């Protein structure tokens, strides 16, 4: 007797599945919050060079003449390109000549200015303090935020790999609960460190544990149900992320100091760890290893939950042993990576599939972590990304049946791509339309992820199917690391980052219909 018959006589759609779906989807919201917090915990508020005559009340008490604050600001700080005071320069000697309008204040050499040797002054209109304010990553080290985000994503990658191996060797629920605890502890410790490298290291560990819990949640959610309702489980696991975006919006609107926000986001994972003990472990994996009694215990439990004790009373050890004998082998795992490239018919089916996976990690994270520039109100913008995602996410599954197979993937990438290209041409005065085009861009990229998981399976044969979706996972992560690093090239122009981020999916999507 095979395992599906046992899962059939125990219950696949019973209430137990609903309870487990709720209890495992709820933490996905907070995982999304931890992943997206870098948009609010490290914002860049306005800044100007520290001034002796403006800031120090000692010199403020000795000022000859009661001039307006705008006058003093014009005297101390040269103007900038946006008619605002310059952000990294200061007049070395108070220039009183600038007051007279008879002299056109335009011939100022950089030799008359000096770098800010007395710190900076930030505005506290909407943010009380962020790490940009705390450690002054401005005007010389402004390239240290993409470094932090790249470190976070590298942490996700390494943690995913290590936790995958460990969960294959140890179990699902064990690695799940220990990853919960690791997220909680590492977040708590990261919310109090005094210097920057320690903050980076503990963000690394947080991301590793988050990758672990995400993968194990996916596996456990898919495994304990029948093959009929799998895609519904994947759909719920996808909706978790959008609801997490909305939660991030609300929570960030709540708290404005990066330490308290970080603690509030990292707290409830201990509560999740505290109740992760009552969930029954996966029985199929236990059958694979060979601990039959444990599997029978878990099966009797889950059957007793669904009010199906009578039929499960017949379960015995020998039928589980025969099921183990019917379990397939994974010895061939070594040569699957080779034959994916060796056979010509399978070479091209991969080189296109990865560019579908790589284009998502590169375009999404390169923008969704820079919501400061693509609009004005961050709290409302962060919320709309999650709200719009659901209509597109539900609509895309409808479009599958009507427009066909090949035309689904190609369509769900050109549309998010062309909106980013149109961002530069739209005049800077029309701020409303510039923001609305950004939301539809980042929002529609949610359904782009849902489709590639579905189309990954039907392309490759079932023998090597697990391997192909595996490599698609690495190219998606390995591309995310190169996401934020692109924003370094903004020094050449403010439009160039918006050019690279949108051309990649269009060149990916239009090339995906060739399958
Ligand atoms: C899962 C990752 C590593 S990305 C990621 C990293 C950290 N935390 C959440 C996500 C994430 C994954 C799939 C999503 C989808 N759809 C999604 C949607 C919104 C927000 C986050 C994600 C990937 O590249 O596969």
Short mmCIF file of C-alpha atoms and ligand atoms in Angstrom, two decimals:
data_model
loop_
_atom_site.label_atom_id
_atom_site.label_comp_id
_atom_site.label_asym_id
_atom_site.label_seq_id
_atom_site.Cartn_x
_atom_site.Cartn_y
_atom_site.Cartn_z
CA UNK A 1 0.00 0.00 0.00
CA UNK A 2 1.30 3.43 -0.98
CA UNK A 3 1.23 6.53 1.19
CA UNK A 4 -1.55 8.40 -0.71
CA UNK A 5 -4.04 5.67 0.25
CA UNK A 6 -3.07 6.08 3.91
CA UNK A 7 -3.42 9.86 3.68
CA UNK A 8 -6.80 9.23 2.05
CA UNK A 9 -8.08 7.02 4.86
CA UNK A 10 -6.74 9.45 7.47
CA UNK A 11 -8.10 12.66 5.93
CA UNK A 12 -6.74 15.22 3.48
CA UNK A 13 -9.33 18.01 3.49
CA UNK A 14 -10.48 17.68 7.11
CA UNK A 15 -10.56 20.53 9.65
CA UNK A 16 -7.02 19.67 10.77
CA UNK A 17 -5.73 20.98 7.45
CA UNK A 18 -7.58 24.26 7.95
CA UNK A 19 -6.13 24.67 11.44
CA UNK A 20 -2.60 23.93 10.24
CA UNK A 21 -3.00 26.31 7.30
CA UNK A 22 -3.97 29.14 9.64
CA UNK A 23 -1.28 28.34 12.21
CA UNK A 24 1.46 28.21 9.56
CA UNK A 25 0.34 31.10 7.35
CA UNK A 26 0.03 33.60 10.22
CA UNK A 27 3.85 33.84 10.76
CA UNK A 28 4.47 34.47 7.05
CA UNK A 29 3.14 38.01 7.54
CA UNK A 30 5.80 38.74 10.14
CA UNK A 31 8.50 37.06 8.05
CA UNK A 32 7.58 39.50 5.27
CA UNK A 33 7.71 42.34 7.81
CA UNK A 34 11.22 41.35 8.90
CA UNK A 35 12.29 41.18 5.26
CA UNK A 36 10.82 44.57 4.31
CA UNK A 37 11.66 46.53 7.48
CA UNK A 38 14.78 48.02 5.86
CA UNK A 39 12.49 50.47 4.06
CA UNK A 40 11.55 52.22 7.32
CA UNK A 41 14.30 51.36 9.81
CA UNK A 42 16.95 52.96 7.56
CA UNK A 43 15.24 55.89 5.84
CA UNK A 44 17.26 58.95 4.80
CA UNK A 45 15.89 62.19 6.29
CA UNK A 46 16.95 65.63 5.10
CA UNK A 47 20.34 66.88 6.28
CA UNK A 48 22.59 69.92 6.16
CA UNK A 49 26.08 70.71 7.38
CA UNK A 50 26.45 71.62 11.04
CA UNK A 51 26.86 75.35 11.58
CA UNK A 52 28.54 77.26 14.44
CA UNK A 53 26.40 80.38 14.11
CA UNK A 54 23.14 78.48 13.57
CA UNK A 55 23.42 75.55 15.98
CA UNK A 56 25.72 76.51 18.87
CA UNK A 57 23.68 78.68 21.23
CA UNK A 58 27.00 79.97 22.57
CA UNK A 59 27.56 81.80 19.28
CA UNK A 60 23.81 82.36 18.85
CA UNK A 61 23.91 84.59 21.93
CA UNK A 62 26.68 86.70 20.35
CA UNK A 63 25.19 87.38 16.89
CA UNK A 64 25.37 91.05 15.81
CA UNK A 65 22.08 91.75 14.08
CA UNK A 66 18.69 90.04 14.23
CA UNK A 67 18.55 88.52 10.76
CA UNK A 68 16.07 85.88 9.66
CA UNK A 69 17.00 82.23 9.85
CA UNK A 70 16.83 82.05 6.05
CA UNK A 71 19.44 84.84 5.95
CA UNK A 72 21.81 82.94 8.22
CA UNK A 73 21.23 79.76 6.21
CA UNK A 74 22.17 81.65 3.04
CA UNK A 75 25.25 83.06 4.77
CA UNK A 76 26.57 79.74 6.06
CA UNK A 77 25.62 77.09 3.46
CA UNK A 78 25.98 77.43 -0.33
CA UNK A 79 22.90 76.63 -2.42
CA UNK A 80 22.42 73.20 -3.94
CA UNK A 81 21.10 71.93 -7.28
CA UNK A 82 17.53 71.67 -5.94
CA UNK A 83 17.68 75.26 -4.58
CA UNK A 84 18.17 73.66 -1.14
CA UNK A 85 21.29 74.18 0.99
CA UNK A 86 24.18 71.93 0.02
CA UNK A 87 24.32 68.70 1.97
CA UNK A 88 28.07 68.06 2.27
CA UNK A 89 29.69 71.52 2.28
CA UNK A 90 30.07 74.52 4.57
CA UNK A 91 31.52 78.01 4.19
CA UNK A 92 34.81 77.89 6.10
CA UNK A 93 34.45 81.56 7.14
CA UNK A 94 31.09 83.34 7.58
CA UNK A 95 30.62 85.13 4.25
CA UNK A 96 28.87 88.41 4.99
CA UNK A 97 29.30 89.56 1.38
CA UNK A 98 26.45 87.29 0.28
CA UNK A 99 23.80 89.57 1.81
CA UNK A 100 24.08 92.31 -0.82
CA UNK A 101 21.98 91.56 -3.90
CA UNK A 102 24.28 93.83 -5.93
CA UNK A 103 26.72 90.89 -6.18
CA UNK A 104 25.61 87.84 -8.16
CA UNK A 105 26.36 84.98 -5.75
CA UNK A 106 27.55 82.41 -8.28
CA UNK A 107 31.39 82.56 -8.37
CA UNK A 108 32.31 80.44 -5.35
CA UNK A 109 35.27 78.06 -5.57
CA UNK A 110 35.32 74.80 -3.62
CA UNK A 111 38.45 76.08 -1.86
CA UNK A 112 36.27 78.42 0.22
CA UNK A 113 34.34 75.43 1.63
CA UNK A 114 35.32 72.53 3.87
CA UNK A 115 33.78 69.12 4.58
CA UNK A 116 31.50 68.74 7.58
CA UNK A 117 33.88 68.18 10.50
CA UNK A 118 31.21 68.81 13.18
CA UNK A 119 28.51 66.29 12.31
CA UNK A 120 25.21 66.81 10.53
CA UNK A 121 21.76 68.13 11.39
CA UNK A 122 18.72 66.06 10.44
CA UNK A 123 15.04 66.96 10.43
CA UNK A 124 12.70 65.10 12.78
CA UNK A 125 9.42 65.95 11.05
CA UNK A 126 8.36 62.37 10.30
CA UNK A 127 11.17 60.09 11.53
CA UNK A 128 12.62 60.31 15.03
CA UNK A 129 15.84 58.39 14.31
CA UNK A 130 17.05 55.84 11.77
CA UNK A 131 20.43 54.15 11.36
CA UNK A 132 21.31 56.81 8.78
CA UNK A 133 20.80 59.32 11.59
CA UNK A 134 22.54 57.19 14.22
CA UNK A 135 25.78 56.33 12.42
CA UNK A 136 25.91 59.16 9.84
CA UNK A 137 26.17 57.20 6.59
CA UNK A 138 25.98 60.42 4.58
CA UNK A 139 28.04 62.30 1.99
CA UNK A 140 31.07 60.03 2.28
CA UNK A 141 29.71 56.58 3.17
CA UNK A 142 26.37 56.93 1.34
CA UNK A 143 27.25 53.64 -0.37
CA UNK A 144 26.91 51.65 2.87
CA UNK A 145 23.17 50.95 2.75
CA UNK A 146 23.21 48.70 -0.36
CA UNK A 147 26.07 46.88 1.35
CA UNK A 148 23.80 46.11 4.31
CA UNK A 149 20.99 44.94 2.04
CA UNK A 150 23.33 42.74 -0.01
CA UNK A 151 24.61 41.21 3.23
CA UNK A 152 21.02 40.48 4.26
CA UNK A 153 20.31 38.71 0.97
CA UNK A 154 23.55 36.71 1.13
CA UNK A 155 22.39 35.64 4.57
CA UNK A 156 19.10 34.47 3.07
CA UNK A 157 21.01 32.40 0.51
CA UNK A 158 23.46 30.72 2.89
CA UNK A 159 20.72 30.06 5.43
CA UNK A 160 18.44 28.52 2.82
CA UNK A 161 21.17 26.09 1.74
CA UNK A 162 22.29 25.12 5.25
CA UNK A 163 18.76 24.78 6.63
CA UNK A 164 17.79 22.69 3.61
CA UNK A 165 20.53 20.18 4.33
CA UNK A 166 19.85 20.21 8.07
CA UNK A 167 16.10 19.69 7.63
CA UNK A 168 16.73 16.84 5.22
CA UNK A 169 18.98 15.20 7.82
CA UNK A 170 16.92 15.99 10.95
CA UNK A 171 13.25 16.65 10.13
CA UNK A 172 10.81 19.44 9.36
CA UNK A 173 9.23 20.56 12.64
CA UNK A 174 12.55 20.54 14.52
CA UNK A 175 14.29 22.87 12.10
CA UNK A 176 11.12 24.97 11.94
CA UNK A 177 10.94 25.59 15.68
CA UNK A 178 14.68 26.19 16.04
CA UNK A 179 14.54 28.68 13.15
CA UNK A 180 11.72 30.48 14.94
CA UNK A 181 13.89 30.77 18.05
CA UNK A 182 16.93 31.88 16.04
CA UNK A 183 14.96 34.65 14.31
CA UNK A 184 13.63 35.88 17.65
CA UNK A 185 17.00 35.92 19.43
CA UNK A 186 18.98 37.40 16.55
CA UNK A 187 16.42 40.15 15.99
CA UNK A 188 16.39 41.04 19.68
CA UNK A 189 20.18 41.27 19.82
CA UNK A 190 20.37 43.24 16.56
CA UNK A 191 17.97 45.80 17.97
CA UNK A 192 20.57 46.93 20.58
CA UNK A 193 24.06 46.78 19.05
CA UNK A 194 26.18 49.97 19.22
CA UNK A 195 28.23 49.82 16.00
CA UNK A 196 27.57 49.07 12.34
CA UNK A 197 29.43 45.75 11.72
CA UNK A 198 27.60 44.03 14.58
CA UNK A 199 24.30 45.24 13.14
CA UNK A 200 25.27 43.80 9.76
CA UNK A 201 26.29 40.45 11.26
CA UNK A 202 23.05 40.04 13.18
CA UNK A 203 20.97 41.03 10.17
CA UNK A 204 22.88 38.27 8.37
CA UNK A 205 21.89 35.71 11.00
CA UNK A 206 18.28 36.94 11.02
CA UNK A 207 18.04 36.49 7.25
CA UNK A 208 19.54 33.00 7.42
CA UNK A 209 16.99 31.85 9.99
CA UNK A 210 14.17 33.50 8.02
CA UNK A 211 15.10 31.56 4.89
CA UNK A 212 15.09 28.39 6.97
CA UNK A 213 11.62 28.93 8.42
CA UNK A 214 10.21 29.97 5.03
CA UNK A 215 11.41 26.83 3.25
CA UNK A 216 10.28 24.50 6.03
CA UNK A 217 6.86 26.16 6.22
CA UNK A 218 6.42 25.62 2.49
CA UNK A 219 7.41 21.96 2.74
CA UNK A 220 5.23 21.14 5.75
CA UNK A 221 2.24 22.97 4.28
CA UNK A 222 2.49 21.09 0.98
CA UNK A 223 3.20 17.66 2.44
CA UNK A 224 0.37 17.01 4.92
CA UNK A 225 -2.35 17.32 2.25
CA UNK A 226 -3.47 15.39 -0.80
CA UNK A 227 -2.21 16.10 -4.30
CA UNK A 228 -5.56 17.65 -5.24
CA UNK A 229 -5.36 20.78 -3.07
CA UNK A 230 -1.65 21.60 -3.41
CA UNK A 231 -2.02 24.70 -5.59
CA UNK A 232 -4.55 26.12 -3.12
CA UNK A 233 -1.94 25.81 -0.37
CA UNK A 234 0.63 27.54 -2.58
CA UNK A 235 -1.90 30.29 -3.27
CA UNK A 236 -2.44 30.89 0.45
CA UNK A 237 1.33 30.89 1.00
CA UNK A 238 1.57 33.58 -1.68
CA UNK A 239 -1.24 35.73 -0.24
CA UNK A 240 0.61 35.69 3.07
CA UNK A 241 3.25 37.99 1.59
CA UNK A 242 0.76 40.64 0.44
CA UNK A 243 -0.98 40.70 3.80
CA UNK A 244 2.47 41.01 5.37
CA UNK A 245 3.14 44.08 3.23
CA UNK A 246 -0.05 45.68 4.56
CA UNK A 247 0.97 44.76 8.11
CA UNK A 248 4.39 46.36 7.58
CA UNK A 249 2.71 49.55 6.42
CA UNK A 250 0.51 49.74 9.50
CA UNK A 251 3.24 48.83 12.00
CA UNK A 252 5.71 51.34 10.53
CA UNK A 253 2.97 53.95 10.77
CA UNK A 254 2.74 53.00 14.44
CA UNK A 255 6.35 53.34 15.64
CA UNK A 256 8.99 55.84 14.48
CA UNK A 257 12.23 54.87 16.28
CA UNK A 258 14.17 52.13 14.53
CA UNK A 259 15.08 50.32 17.75
CA UNK A 260 11.51 50.06 19.04
CA UNK A 261 10.22 49.15 15.58
CA UNK A 262 12.87 46.44 15.24
CA UNK A 263 11.99 45.01 18.66
CA UNK A 264 8.26 45.05 17.95
CA UNK A 265 8.85 43.20 14.68
CA UNK A 266 11.24 40.66 16.20
CA UNK A 267 9.20 39.91 19.34
CA UNK A 268 6.33 37.54 18.39
CA UNK A 269 8.62 34.87 16.94
CA UNK A 270 9.19 33.66 20.49
CA UNK A 271 5.42 33.26 20.81
CA UNK A 272 5.47 31.25 17.58
CA UNK A 273 8.30 29.09 18.96
CA UNK A 274 6.28 28.50 22.12
CA UNK A 275 3.35 26.93 20.26
CA UNK A 276 5.29 25.22 17.47
CA UNK A 277 5.60 22.20 19.79
CA UNK A 278 2.03 20.94 19.38
CA UNK A 279 2.16 20.51 15.59
CA UNK A 280 2.53 16.89 14.42
CA UNK A 281 5.65 16.17 12.40
CA UNK A 282 5.60 15.02 8.79
CA UNK A 283 4.96 11.29 8.62
CA UNK A 284 6.24 10.70 5.08
CA UNK A 285 9.79 11.77 5.92
CA UNK A 286 9.75 9.59 9.04
CA UNK A 287 8.71 6.71 6.79
CA UNK A 288 11.67 7.50 4.54
CA UNK A 289 14.21 7.34 7.38
CA UNK A 290 12.65 4.28 9.00
CA UNK A 291 11.13 5.25 12.36
CA UNK A 292 7.77 3.60 11.80
CA UNK A 293 6.34 3.82 15.32
CA UNK A 294 6.65 7.60 15.36
CA UNK A 295 4.90 7.86 11.99
CA UNK A 296 2.05 5.64 13.17
CA UNK A 297 1.70 7.78 16.29
CA UNK A 298 1.45 10.99 14.26
CA UNK A 299 -1.03 9.38 11.86
CA UNK A 300 -3.26 8.16 14.69
CA UNK A 301 -3.15 11.68 16.15
CA UNK A 302 -4.10 13.50 12.95
CA UNK A 303 -6.84 10.95 12.28
CA UNK A 304 -8.25 11.40 15.79
CA UNK A 305 -8.35 15.15 15.18
CA UNK A 306 -10.54 14.79 12.07
CA UNK A 307 -13.08 12.54 13.87
CA UNK A 308 -11.97 9.53 11.80
CA UNK A 309 -10.74 7.13 14.47
CA UNK A 310 -12.79 4.13 13.29
CA UNK A 311 -11.08 3.74 9.91
CA UNK A 312 -7.63 4.53 11.33
CA UNK A 313 -8.05 1.83 13.99
CA UNK A 314 -6.95 -0.64 11.28
CA UNK A 315 -3.52 0.96 10.79
CA UNK A 316 -0.62 -1.35 11.67
CA UNK A 317 3.16 -1.36 11.38
CA UNK A 318 3.58 -3.80 8.49
CA UNK A 319 1.57 -1.75 5.99
CA UNK A 320 3.72 1.27 6.84
CA UNK A 321 6.78 -0.93 6.28
CA UNK A 322 5.47 -1.94 2.85
CA UNK A 323 4.83 1.74 2.09
CA UNK A 324 8.45 2.46 3.03
CA UNK A 325 9.49 -0.30 0.63
CA UNK A 326 7.47 1.51 -2.05
CA UNK A 327 9.26 4.80 -1.30
CA UNK A 328 11.36 6.04 -4.25
CA UNK A 329 15.12 6.50 -4.05
CA UNK A 330 17.09 9.72 -4.46
CA UNK A 331 20.45 8.12 -5.27
CA UNK A 332 20.39 9.70 -8.75
CA UNK A 333 20.62 13.19 -7.19
CA UNK A 334 24.24 13.43 -8.31
CA UNK A 335 23.77 13.17 -12.08
CA UNK A 336 20.55 15.20 -12.38
CA UNK A 337 22.57 18.43 -12.36
CA UNK A 338 24.69 17.07 -15.20
CA UNK A 339 22.02 15.70 -17.54
CA UNK A 340 20.09 18.97 -17.25
CA UNK A 341 22.90 20.46 -19.35
CA UNK A 342 24.12 17.43 -21.32
CA UNK A 343 20.98 16.57 -23.30
CA UNK A 344 20.27 19.25 -25.95
CA UNK A 345 16.51 19.11 -25.42
CA UNK A 346 16.98 19.98 -21.75
CA UNK A 347 19.73 22.58 -22.21
CA UNK A 348 17.51 25.34 -23.63
CA UNK A 349 14.57 24.62 -21.32
CA UNK A 350 16.77 25.61 -18.39
CA UNK A 351 18.64 28.63 -19.79
CA UNK A 352 15.26 30.28 -20.33
CA UNK A 353 13.72 29.12 -17.05
CA UNK A 354 16.50 30.64 -14.93
CA UNK A 355 16.23 34.01 -16.68
CA UNK A 356 12.59 33.92 -15.62
CA UNK A 357 13.69 33.30 -12.04
CA UNK A 358 16.66 35.69 -12.14
CA UNK A 359 14.58 38.54 -13.55
CA UNK A 360 12.30 38.50 -10.50
CA UNK A 361 14.99 38.70 -7.83
CA UNK A 362 16.81 41.44 -9.72
CA UNK A 363 13.89 43.76 -10.48
CA UNK A 364 11.72 43.39 -7.38
CA UNK A 365 14.26 43.81 -4.58
CA UNK A 366 16.16 46.52 -6.46
CA UNK A 367 13.09 48.77 -6.16
CA UNK A 368 10.91 47.57 -3.27
CA UNK A 369 13.73 48.56 -0.91
CA UNK A 370 13.93 52.12 -2.32
CA UNK A 371 10.40 53.38 -1.78
CA UNK A 372 11.85 56.68 -0.55
CA UNK A 373 12.44 57.99 -4.08
CA UNK A 374 9.48 56.53 -6.02
CA UNK A 375 7.01 58.73 -4.12
CA UNK A 376 6.41 60.99 -1.16
CA UNK A 377 4.20 59.23 1.42
CA UNK A 378 5.91 55.97 2.31
CA UNK A 379 3.23 54.66 4.67
CA UNK A 380 0.50 54.77 2.02
CA UNK A 381 2.77 53.56 -0.79
CA UNK A 382 3.93 50.53 1.21
CA UNK A 383 0.29 49.56 1.79
CA UNK A 384 -0.86 49.88 -1.83
CA UNK A 385 1.74 47.37 -3.05
CA UNK A 386 -0.05 44.68 -1.06
CA UNK A 387 -3.60 45.76 -1.85
CA UNK A 388 -3.23 45.90 -5.64
CA UNK A 389 -1.34 42.58 -5.68
CA UNK A 390 -4.40 40.50 -4.80
CA UNK A 391 -6.63 41.53 -7.76
CA UNK A 392 -3.74 40.89 -10.15
CA UNK A 393 -2.87 37.66 -8.33
CA UNK A 394 -6.43 36.36 -8.57
CA UNK A 395 -6.88 37.68 -12.11
CA UNK A 396 -3.74 36.02 -13.45
CA UNK A 397 -4.99 32.54 -12.52
CA UNK A 398 -8.14 33.39 -14.47
CA UNK A 399 -6.12 34.53 -17.49
CA UNK A 400 -4.38 31.14 -17.67
CA UNK A 401 -7.40 29.28 -19.05
CA UNK A 402 -8.60 31.92 -21.52
CA UNK A 403 -5.41 33.14 -23.22
CA UNK A 404 -3.47 29.86 -23.07
CA UNK A 405 -0.19 28.56 -21.71
CA UNK A 406 2.71 30.18 -23.58
CA UNK A 407 1.22 33.68 -23.43
CA UNK A 408 0.94 33.77 -19.62
CA UNK A 409 4.59 34.14 -18.60
CA UNK A 410 5.44 36.52 -21.45
CA UNK A 411 2.57 38.83 -20.51
CA UNK A 412 3.26 38.95 -16.76
CA UNK A 413 6.76 40.39 -17.31
CA UNK A 414 6.36 42.88 -20.17
CA UNK A 415 3.66 44.75 -18.25
CA UNK A 416 5.74 45.26 -15.05
CA UNK A 417 8.68 46.13 -17.28
CA UNK A 418 7.13 48.84 -19.44
CA UNK A 419 5.77 50.74 -16.43
CA UNK A 420 9.30 51.26 -15.11
CA UNK A 421 10.49 52.54 -18.49
CA UNK A 422 7.60 55.04 -18.57
CA UNK A 423 8.63 56.45 -15.18
CA UNK A 424 11.49 58.55 -16.56
CA UNK A 425 9.60 60.15 -19.45
CA UNK A 426 6.65 61.36 -17.36
CA UNK A 427 7.25 64.99 -16.29
CA UNK A 428 8.35 65.61 -12.71
CA UNK A 429 5.42 67.98 -12.10
CA UNK A 430 2.78 65.24 -12.39
CA UNK A 431 3.67 63.52 -9.13
CA UNK A 432 0.42 61.59 -8.74
CA UNK A 433 0.73 59.73 -12.03
CA UNK A 434 4.42 59.07 -11.38
CA UNK A 435 3.54 57.32 -8.12
CA UNK A 436 0.56 55.36 -9.48
CA UNK A 437 2.75 53.94 -12.25
CA UNK A 438 5.20 52.74 -9.61
CA UNK A 439 2.53 50.89 -7.61
CA UNK A 440 1.24 48.97 -10.62
CA UNK A 441 4.84 48.07 -11.42
CA UNK A 442 5.76 46.63 -8.03
CA UNK A 443 2.26 45.27 -7.48
CA UNK A 444 2.02 43.25 -10.68
CA UNK A 445 5.39 41.62 -9.95
CA UNK A 446 3.63 39.58 -7.27
CA UNK A 447 1.65 37.56 -9.80
CA UNK A 448 4.86 37.18 -11.82
CA UNK A 449 6.21 35.04 -8.98
CA UNK A 450 3.08 32.91 -8.64
CA UNK A 451 3.13 31.87 -12.29
CA UNK A 452 6.76 30.73 -12.46
CA UNK A 453 6.28 28.22 -9.64
CA UNK A 454 3.33 26.71 -11.52
CA UNK A 455 5.00 26.69 -14.93
CA UNK A 456 8.23 25.24 -13.53
CA UNK A 457 6.65 21.83 -12.99
CA UNK A 458 4.84 21.16 -16.26
CA UNK A 459 7.91 21.95 -18.37
CA UNK A 460 10.27 19.38 -16.85
CA UNK A 461 9.61 15.64 -16.46
CA UNK A 462 8.67 14.38 -13.02
CA UNK A 463 11.96 12.49 -12.67
CA UNK A 464 14.14 15.63 -12.69
CA UNK A 465 11.38 18.04 -11.65
CA UNK A 466 12.70 18.66 -8.14
CA UNK A 467 16.12 19.56 -9.54
CA UNK A 468 14.85 22.12 -12.07
CA UNK A 469 12.80 24.03 -9.49
CA UNK A 470 15.90 23.86 -7.31
CA UNK A 471 18.19 25.68 -9.73
CA UNK A 472 15.43 28.21 -10.35
CA UNK A 473 15.61 29.02 -6.65
CA UNK A 474 19.34 29.75 -6.68
CA UNK A 475 19.16 32.02 -9.74
CA UNK A 476 16.36 33.95 -8.06
CA UNK A 477 18.40 34.53 -4.90
CA UNK A 478 21.74 35.00 -6.64
CA UNK A 479 20.08 37.75 -8.63
CA UNK A 480 18.61 39.49 -5.59
CA UNK A 481 22.10 40.20 -4.21
CA UNK A 482 22.88 42.09 -7.41
CA UNK A 483 19.64 44.02 -6.85
CA UNK A 484 20.53 46.82 -4.43
CA UNK A 485 24.12 47.07 -5.67
CA UNK A 486 22.80 48.57 -8.91
CA UNK A 487 21.68 51.70 -7.05
CA UNK A 488 25.36 52.60 -6.68
CA UNK A 489 25.45 53.68 -10.34
CA UNK A 490 23.10 56.60 -9.64
CA UNK A 491 26.05 59.01 -9.54
CA UNK A 492 26.10 59.06 -13.34
CA UNK A 493 22.41 59.92 -13.45
CA UNK A 494 19.21 59.61 -11.45
CA UNK A 495 17.57 57.91 -14.44
CA UNK A 496 20.11 55.14 -15.13
CA UNK A 497 19.02 52.89 -12.21
CA UNK A 498 15.46 53.18 -13.51
CA UNK A 499 16.69 52.08 -16.94
CA UNK A 500 18.47 48.88 -15.91
CA UNK A 501 15.75 47.74 -13.51
CA UNK A 502 13.03 47.69 -16.18
CA UNK A 503 14.88 46.49 -19.27
CA UNK A 504 15.90 43.18 -17.65
CA UNK A 505 12.36 41.73 -17.29
CA UNK A 506 11.25 42.86 -20.76
CA UNK A 507 14.32 41.16 -22.22
CA UNK A 508 13.46 38.16 -20.04
CA UNK A 509 9.72 37.99 -20.63
CA UNK A 510 9.69 38.36 -24.41
CA UNK A 511 12.37 35.66 -24.54
CA UNK A 512 10.31 33.30 -22.37
CA UNK A 513 7.57 32.70 -24.95
CA UNK A 514 10.14 30.90 -27.14
CA UNK A 515 9.46 27.69 -25.18
C1 LIG B 1 11.80 33.91 -1.25
C2 LIG B 1 12.84 34.79 -1.94
C3 LIG B 1 14.20 34.61 -1.27
S1 LIG B 1 12.35 36.53 -1.83
C4 LIG B 1 11.92 36.97 -0.12
C5 LIG B 1 12.89 37.18 0.79
C6 LIG B 1 12.54 37.51 2.09
N1 LIG B 1 11.25 37.62 2.44
C7 LIG B 1 10.28 37.41 1.52
C8 LIG B 1 10.62 37.07 0.23
C9 LIG B 1 9.53 36.84 -0.82
C10 LIG B 1 9.55 35.63 -1.63
C11 LIG B 1 8.47 35.49 -2.61
C12 LIG B 1 7.57 36.55 -2.63
C13 LIG B 1 6.42 36.47 -3.63
N2 LIG B 1 5.57 36.40 -4.37
C14 LIG B 1 7.60 37.62 -1.88
C15 LIG B 1 6.61 38.59 -2.03
C16 LIG B 1 6.63 39.72 -1.25
C17 LIG B 1 7.61 39.89 -0.33
C18 LIG B 1 8.57 38.93 -0.19
C19 LIG B 1 8.56 37.78 -0.99
C20 LIG B 1 12.94 34.42 -3.41
O1 LIG B 1 13.56 35.18 -4.20
O2 LIG B 1 12.40 33.37 -3.83
#
